[model samples]
Target: SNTQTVLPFTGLNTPSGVAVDSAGTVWVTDHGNNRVVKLAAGSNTQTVLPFTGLNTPSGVAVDSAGTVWVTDHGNNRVVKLAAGSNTQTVLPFTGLNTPSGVAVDSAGTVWVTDHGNNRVVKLAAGSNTQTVLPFTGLNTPSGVAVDSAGTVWVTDHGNNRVVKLAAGSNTQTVLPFTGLNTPSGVAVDSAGTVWVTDHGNNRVVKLAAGSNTQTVLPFTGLNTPSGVAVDSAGTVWVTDHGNNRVVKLAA
Candidate 1:
């Protein structure tokens, strides 16, 4: 069976984002509950992190150094919690209108999807100034994923499509996939396979590195699946928003 384990989160409310660190630890954003939770590697119990007044925390990502970054959607900002610290620091970048998705590349370059502004903003490793990407014609972009090659992928929810921008290219190519009804979250594995949670369709789908088609995974009892993450071994973790649980899809 593709389904491995179903993790029941007690207080989870409208879970929006899921992330896996190198150690297999899972980080999830409980949107309605306004908090982020952590599940240590090899453990099923999840604990809420030390975040206070997180306004609809949505997208979550963990850097190589164990720093936790989350998109405070209601606050229109991104917050960072360092490896060993419970302190949450709101990033310096300002003027973000309802930012939703966040992803960090190997070089620590931070990429965020400014959902309301219909564009993507990025901050270099140590830079304070966030640059607005050149992507135009974007509509409510929600999920962002950066492959190892610096290529960026985004789930344009309002536009009903997924687009990719290369390392140094301004052009964004729309991925050819069908049955994509409001693609909400996306994750890219080591081999560049893209995993997406079709929120409106209630299904999980994937596209191989160079594939032009999509494969809908046989995930049952998924209601409004929102966040998708892929671990190092290519295993997938999905946040079942409507079910108040997490689903593990073994690789």
Candidate 2:
């Protein structure tokens, strides 16, 4: 019998977004529960982080320094908790309409998809200036990711496509796909492989560094998986949203 590791949590409801840290900790945004939870490398129990101002948190990301970032969706703000700190900072900015997905690049720049506004914004390293990316016609942009080369990848859910944008440039290229429905949650591994979760199709797909064709991952019986993350070891972590559980496919 083949079994999978299902992370356990208390009072978990509509758990949607997930991120895996370098130390093997999985950070998840318990969407309906209105909290962020974490499962450490060796801990069996998922612990909810003690933070303030989480309203329908949708996206999550953990940086190399153990910092955790979550997009407070309903509140239209971004919040981050530094490692070993109880204080959670709600990033100050204005004019964000339903910020959904959050990603931090190697340079400490935070990228966020302004879903309701249909655009992307970023806070560059050491700067409070919030810059809006100028991509023509980005519809219902949801998930975002930054690769080692500092390039940003975004899933345009309303358009049923994913786009690649280079750092310091606004031009983008939409990747090829077939039968993609409600695409969300994009992640890049150390080997430059890109992974995406198709929520409506109940599928997860991966694209190698240069391959145009996406190979569907063999994650059977998934229902509306929304968020995905890849650790350095290549283990794929998915938030099986419809099933209200986090599933792990090891490398």
How badly does each model clash, as a count of residue pairs? 0, 0
What TM-score does structure 1 among the candidates reach? Answer: 0.96
Best by TM-score: 1
What does candidate 2's lDDT look like per residue over 1-251, in tens digits? 13457776566778879998777788899999899988877766678887786889999988888888999998999999988789899776568888889998777889999999999888888999888876668888889998877788888988888888876786888777677888988988767788999887998998888898898887878898989998888888889888888888886
| lDDT per residue as tens, model 1, 14-56 | 8999998888788899998999988877666778888776898
Q: Considering only N, C-alpha and C atoms within 3 Å, which residue pairs clash in candidate 1?
A: none
Displacement of residue 209 (Cα, Å) in model 1 is: 1.5
* lDDT of candidate 1 at residue 179, scale 0 to 100: 67
Tell me how far candidate 1 lies from the true structure as C-alpha RMSD in angstroms: 1.3
Superposition error at 140 for model 1 (Å): 0.7
lDDT of 2 at 190: 67
The 0-to-1 C-alpha lDDT of every candidate, in the order given, reads 0.88, 0.85
